[PDB]
Ligand binder design. Structure first.
Ligand code: HEM
Length: 145
């Protein structure tokens, strides 16, 4: 994927990862509402939809998602450095009940969050680069299923 387009489009979002990751998750739950109970059942401190989603565990996972995307961005020129990490990350999600299909919905949610932050700066070339980068991340995780 075009590295300069990826790095530049990620800069501002990367500086406020919880705010932007929260936008991503809201879109994800809109597209795939069955993910909400999956998080709820995996939550340990609280039990309710709302208490789980505002919990440190859930906020931690938002940061983890953004950490992984940041790892893909900073390794865009050679994602081979994340192949084993991502295969294992896929195996881990499969074990907690996540479907591989849900990661395509995450991609749609990522693109939505970037377009919301960047507005007209999110060009079709920038979209294509992200689709290719995130697709490569999902391809590497798909080894886990
Ligand atoms: C599809 C929606 C997703 C759901 C429902 C979900 C749910 C979970 C759950 C329940 C865990 C705990 C796993 C465990 O205790 O072993 C987890 C771990 C994790 N998730 Fe996700 N996740 C999702 C998407 C993502 C994405 C897209 C990323 C990264 C881009 C990500 C990054 C992580 C990381 C880094 C961990 C910690 C893995 C570890 O324990 O080694 N998640 N996720």
């Amino acid at each position: 994927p075009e590295p300069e387009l990826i790095r530049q489009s990620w800069r501002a979002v990367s500086r406020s990862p919880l705010e932007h990751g929260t936008v991503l998750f809201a879109r994800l739950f809109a597209l795939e509402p069955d993910l909400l109970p999956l998080f709820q059942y995996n939550c340990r401190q609280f039990s309710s939809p709302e208490d789980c989603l505002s919990s440190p565990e859930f906020l931690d996972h938002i940061r983890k998602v953004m950490l992984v995307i940041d790892a893909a961005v900073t390794n865009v020129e050679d994602l081979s450095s994340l192949e084993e990490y991502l295969a294992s990350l896929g195996r881990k999600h499969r074990a907690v009940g996540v479907k591989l299909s849900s990661f395509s919905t995450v991609g749609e949610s990522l693109l939505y969050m970037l377009e919301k932050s960047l507005g007209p700066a999110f060009t079709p070339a920038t979209r294509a680069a992200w689709s290719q980068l995130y697709g490569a991340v999902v391809q590497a995780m798909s080894r886990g299923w």
